[PDB]
Design a protein around this ligand. Structure first.
Ligand SMILES: *[C@@H]1O[C@H](CO)[C@@H](O[C@@H]2O[C@H](CO)[C@@H](O[C@@H]3O[C@H](CO[C@H]4O[C@H](CO)[C@@H](O)[C@H](O)[C@@H]4O)[C@@H](O)[C@H](O[C@H]4O[C@H](CO)[C@@H](O)[C@H](O)[C@@H]4O)[C@@H]3O)[C@H](O)[C@H]2NC(C)=O)[C@H](O)[C@H]1NC(C)=O
Ligand SMILES: *[C@@H]1O[C@H](CO)[C@@H](O[C@@H]2O[C@H](CO)[C@@H](O[C@@H]3O[C@H](CO[C@H]4O[C@H](CO)[C@@H](O)[C@H](O)[C@@H]4O)[C@@H](O)[C@H](O[C@H]4O[C@H](CO)[C@@H](O)[C@H](O)[C@@H]4O)[C@@H]3O)[C@H](O)[C@H]2NC(C)=O)[C@H](O)[C@H]1NC(C)=O
Ligand SMILES: *[C@@H]1O[C@H](CO)[C@@H](O[C@@H]2O[C@H](CO)[C@@H](O[C@@H]3O[C@H](CO)[C@@H](O)[C@H](O)[C@@H]3O)[C@H](O)[C@H]2NC(C)=O)[C@H](O)[C@H]1NC(C)=O
Ligand SMILES: *[C@@H]1O[C@H](CO)[C@@H](O)[C@H](O)[C@H]1NC(C)=O
Ligand SMILES: *[C@@H]1O[C@H](CO)[C@@H](O)[C@H](O)[C@H]1NC(C)=O
Ligand SMILES: *[C@@H]1O[C@H](CO)[C@@H](O)[C@H](O)[C@H]1NC(C)=O
Ligand SMILES: *[C@@H]1O[C@H](CO)[C@@H](O)[C@H](O)[C@H]1NC(C)=O
Ligand SMILES: *[C@@H]1O[C@H](CO)[C@@H](O)[C@H](O)[C@H]1NC(C)=O
Lengths: 317, 167, 316
């Protein structure tokens, strides 16, 4: 069971180099029984400059690298280069391609992850894919291939016009919180008549070790009779970026208008988590009326309820 | 009177380009007799074709060509601009029904991407590859101000507004 | 020599492998004398996604494969992914990116106004004009238009060549504090031998009423594992956003690495101020030694000497 690794060398911008080095590494193959084939769009290569040298020998095993030189013009022609190795009568093929290029003919793709508030709370989890800078919407289609899950949910896509004669298409697909927490991913694939190769964007959960955030509410610091009382709710050591902060002062949740949240910044040292501050400023008329003043934080690694509430009372001091 | 024709269909040439002026006219002949006037001053050109290479700001102004004893031709105005985008048209004044060509042109014929055309403050067309606004049948509504915003060398720049008016 | 082959593996559109595995094949280094680091456009990569594994050893030649997991957005953002190897005190950096698509980026000018710290405390403000993405450093020069007021301010135009086939030119003008306090915008112009028009950028103090900032220091909340205290200094209702925040420990200035200041944000209040929560992380040892921490704020709306200090102790 040999291991195949096909790689393409990096284009040096500083050095004046115009040849890309394709390396096909085969590990643990059969001694004296080897065969490496370079295919360009399912066609055998013609150039004989294929430098093949044994990397190393592991007794019954062997590791060998095949080296090929490719012109930049040929590589940019979207040629699907492939390395084929015949092991035990089975032809294993690996196709590289450069990197499915980039945004073609405009059309910028943004795959927005679900908001970290509708997963572990109310039921409305969805994933959205937005394509902007489109010349026209004719014969342009977006698919929502559900990786490793398939399911039965269907997506819905809608168009929108702007003041710069550009068309933006947004497609939303409902998802499942259990599927998201299990590690399943999705693939937004956009196909347009201009470029034959569709553009694919795959979204999964953010990698890393999840940690339980620490939430603390500070009492107002204003001395005597400042009209606009301020409450601070600090959240530290939370990973990944998915987290939401709200308030539930006296039943109904406080509107986002009288509340703000600072941008997340990476904490220096300590752990790998971030730190955020949420500030709630209210006139000195609700301070003598509101009593609950609870800051709630929703994170995907807190606990089974995925909720952490810190309550501050006005009957202090 | 003869007509002054420019080899480039646009009278908004760059700084340093070549422009050929022809004093076209029927039943004239005598190519060796053709006087050229720049701001009313006679030039050194004698033939019916005048070539300008590496045009400067001083070459801007009115050009006139006279042949034989006929009356002087129209003083065609040629103006030289120096900016990132100087979108050009076939003519400042276009008769109704005549074709009109508008193209967003960048410095040293550099390729222009993300070309967006705006008419009197309202966008008209958007393209990723530079194209031509070709109005085969000019209409009254086409009158106004045209300007293009283009992304050249990954930098977005705005062109000089135009005065595209039809009769 | 440590010949760094920084190879980007196949991006695999068909498979669900969004993350690209940059392999930094390192050869020629010395055993147990090599440190591998990752940089994203001159910024250190701190996430622990590195999978540095020893492939093989042929004596002192240890084939090292450092695997960096980069998201598709990062790889396609035309970055400068740098594999840095430190050995024998010598650092070798290999820079990689995608093969060029679209047109190359043009010369872009950036203007840095003087910081309030050097404007109201040290009294040495400086305006910075930096042109980047420049092709050739020939016949390129920077002219500074003083506009209002006249003075002799001859400065430098120093050029630094980067490792991504680009070079930058930086010019710093030490200006007088009084002119900026009263308000006197200047202009920086950069001229290239073959350009349509020289690039000109103007700097002027932001107009608007100045409001005295309100500064409050919150004591550390409870005993959080007895490892970090995370002192908070909230500054609110100040305009403009140009402000200097510092932390002083027992009269000694604290480096900017320890304390993090949030970016200014437009508060929803009618004061049109900005709220910033400067967070200083201090361990148990620092806080338990009866150290008093002072949050210092420098802003133009404050009275003389444009400094406001709020000191919090541990015995309260
Ligand atoms: C023609 O005009 C249209 C309409 O204005 C333009 O379309 C806009 O394009 C911009 C630029 O790509 C888009 O802005 C980007 O949107 C994404 C996120 O925005 C959504 O999500 C946030 C919440 O996360 C909402 O607040 C917001 O309303 C949107 O729903 C991101 O891709 C971008 O932000 C990310 O990248 C930037 C760096 O680029 C970082 O600074 C950010 O922190 C962040 O990581 C960015 O904000 C904008 O959404 C588009 N508008 C619409 C209505 O679709 C066309 O671009 C324009 N065409 C031309 C050719 O000029
Ligand atoms: C080849 O490599 C070089 C070297 O890395 C790159 O040059 C860098 O380019 C970046 C991107 O333009 C420059 O970063 C810009 O700097 C300015 C502000 O940064 C200074 O000030 C802040 C504090 O205000 C300091 O933290 C910082 O260290 C600097 O002292 C601004 O012009 C930019 O910020 C603005 O734009 C960004 C979006 O990019 C917004 O998020 C910001 O809010 C703001 O609006 C930006 O940060 C950097 O300074 C350059 N470095 C050098 C040494 O010149 C080349 O770009 C690269 N070439 C290619 C082709 O990739
Ligand atoms: C013939 O008459 C025409 C009348 O237009 C003259 O054209 C004018 O020439 C002057 C001098 O070159 C131009 O001024 C310059 O304009 C720009 C401004 O950005 C710049 O290059 C210089 O700073 C200078 O001010 C002027 O614009 C131009 N007029 C037009 C409408 O294009 C021409 O010079 C005359 N020829 C002779 C030989 O006298
Ligand atoms: C999707 O778009 C592509 C663009 O090439 C087109 O060939 C194909 O027929 C479209 N599919 C459907 C179902 O419309
Ligand atoms: C103009 O003509 C000259 C020769 O007379 C030539 O060298 C030059 O390249 C031409 N310029 C342009 C812009 O075509
Ligand atoms: C626009 O028209 C001009 C003049 O005929 C021509 O040279 C140019 O190629 C045209 N542009 C495009 C994009 O077709
Ligand atoms: C012509 O264009 C200019 C800007 O170049 C604009 O101010 C003016 O209104 C336009 N129309 C005229 C002069 O009729
Ligand atoms: C600045 O550069 C321009 C363009 O090359 C040049 O004409 C001018 O003489 C330079 N000024 C100096 C070197 O003082």
């Amino acid at each position: 069971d040999p291991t195949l690794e096909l790689l393409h060398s990096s284009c040096d911008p500083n050095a004046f180099h115009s040849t890309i080095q394709l390396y096909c590494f085969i590990y643990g193959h059969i001694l004296n029984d080897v065969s490496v084939s370079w295919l360009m769009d399912d066609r055998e290569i013609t150039d004989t400059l294929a430098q093949t040298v044994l990397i190393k020998e592991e007794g019954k095993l062997a590791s060998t690298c095949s080296k090929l030189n490719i012109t930049e013009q040929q590589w940019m022609s979207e040629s699907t280069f492939t390395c084929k190795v015949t092991s035990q009568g089975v032809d294993y093929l690996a196709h590289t391609r450069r990197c499915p290029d980039h945004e073609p003919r405009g059309v910028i793709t943004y795959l927005i992850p679900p908001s970290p508030l509708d997963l572990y709370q109310n039921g409305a989890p969805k994933l959205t894919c937005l394509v902007v800078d489109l010349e026209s919407e004719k014969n342009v289609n977006v698919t929502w291939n559900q990786e490793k899950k398939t399911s039965v949910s269907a997506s819905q896509w809608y168009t929108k016009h702007h003041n710069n004669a550009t068309t933006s298409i947004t497609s939303i697909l409902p998802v499942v919180a259990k599927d998201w927490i299990e590690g399943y991913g999705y693939q937004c694939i956009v196909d347009h008549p201009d470029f034959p190769k569709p553009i694919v964007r795959s979204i999964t959960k953010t990698p890393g070790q999840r940690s339980a955030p620490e939430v603390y509410v500070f009492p107002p610091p204003e001395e005597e009779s400042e009209d606009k009382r301020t409450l601070t709710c600090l959240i530290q050591n939370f990973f990944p970026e998915d987290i939401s902060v709200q308030w539930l002062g006296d039943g109904k949740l406080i509107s986002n208008s009288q509340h703000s949240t600072t941008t997340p910044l990476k904490s220096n040292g300590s752990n790998q988590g971030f730190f955020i501050f949420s500030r709630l400023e209210v006139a000195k008329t609700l301070w003598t009326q509101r009593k609950q003043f609870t800051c709630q934080v929703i994170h995907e690694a807190l606990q089974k309820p995925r909720k952490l509430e810190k309550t501050i009372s006005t009957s202090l001091g | 009177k003869p007509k002054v024709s420019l080899n480039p269909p646009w009278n908004r040439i760059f700084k340093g380009e070549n422009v050929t002026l022809t004093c076209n006219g029927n039943n004239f002949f005598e190519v060796s007799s053709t006087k050229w006037f720049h701001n009313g001053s006679l030039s050194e050109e004698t033939n019916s074709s005048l070539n300008i290479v590496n045009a400067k700001f001083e070459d801007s102004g009115e050009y006139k060509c006279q042949h034989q004893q006929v009356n002087e031709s129209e003083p065609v105005y040629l103006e030289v601009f120096s900016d990132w985008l100087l979108l050009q048209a076939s003519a400042e004044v276009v008769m109704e029904g005549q074709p009109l060509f508008l193209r967003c042109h960048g410095w040293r014929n550099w390729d222009v991407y993300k070309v967006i055309y705006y008419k009197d403050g309202e966008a008209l067309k958007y393209w990723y590859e530079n194209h031509n606004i070709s109005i085969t049948n000019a209409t009254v509504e086409d009158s106004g101000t045209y300007y293009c915003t283009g992304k050249v060398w990954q930098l977005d720049y705005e062109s000089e507004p135009l005065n595209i008016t039809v009769i």
